[PDB]
Amino acid sequence: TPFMSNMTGWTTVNGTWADTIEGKQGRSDGDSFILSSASGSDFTYESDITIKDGNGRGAGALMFRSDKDAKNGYLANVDAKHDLVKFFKFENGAASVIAEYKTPIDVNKKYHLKTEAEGDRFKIYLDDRLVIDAHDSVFSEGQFGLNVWDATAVFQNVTKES
Ligand SMILES: OC[C@H]1O[C@](O)(CO)[C@@H](O)[C@@H]1O
Ligand code: NA
């Protein structure tokens, strides 16, 4: 098992998801999603994320407090195309952004993305540097997942602690 995670029940919502020696690979034009059967309310959730060459060289994301369809929930991402770390939400099937931090995000560079969620408060860390501290009260609990946007991206050491 080349994909390292402490979570299981990984079930594709859409896009294409496969395990490689670099970890779990997602690939789509636009947004796509894979959900774990694992669920949570307050937690730390993290992954190594690498944007590969291909598609639009866009983004890879943690997803959390997600509904069963990935139509509602929170994401934190690294976006190579836009040079952004975004904290955002889907609500009623569409995305809107809560906070975003500007920094160069390079293709083929491994980033460690960490989210700490506690009640309505979220702290997002990029390679251990705190970059976003935000509030949003829309979702309190749900499934963990992963997302890519206009990208091929690879996720490794995907872990939850609570
Ligand atoms: O940064 C990429 C992300 O940006 C969004 O357009 C939200 O602004 C999402 O659809 C996509 O996953
Ligand atoms: Na970039």
Residue ranges per domain, the chain? Answer: 1-162
Q: How many CA atoms lie within 13 A of 36 on its CB side?
A: 21
**Ion ligand 2 residues within 5 Å by Cβ:** 80, 83, 105
113 DSSP β-pair partners: 47, 126
Q: Which experimental method was this entry solved with?
A: X-ray
Contact in structure between 38 and 10 (CB atoms under 8 Å): no
29 lines ligand 1 (CB under 6 A): no
Q: What are 85's two structure tokens?
A: 């770390």
Residues 6+ apart with CB under 8 A from 86: 59, 75, 76, 77, 79, 97, 99, 100
79 lines ligand 1 (CB under 6 A): yes
150 lines ligand 1 (CB under 6 A): no
Contact in structure between 140 and 64 (CB atoms under 8 Å): no
Determine the residue of 51, 81, 86, 89 to mutate for testing ligand 1's pocket, defined as the one with the most ligand atoms within 8 A of the Cβ atom: 86
DSSP class per residue in 78-140: EETTTTEEEEEEEETTEEEEEEEEE----TT-EEEEEEEEETTEEEEEETTEEEEEEE--S--
d(CA 91, CA 96): 8
d(CA 127, CA 155): 14
Which atom of ligand 1 is nearest the CA belonging to 86?
1
74 lines ligand 1 (CB under 6 A): no
CATH top-level class of 1-162: mainly beta
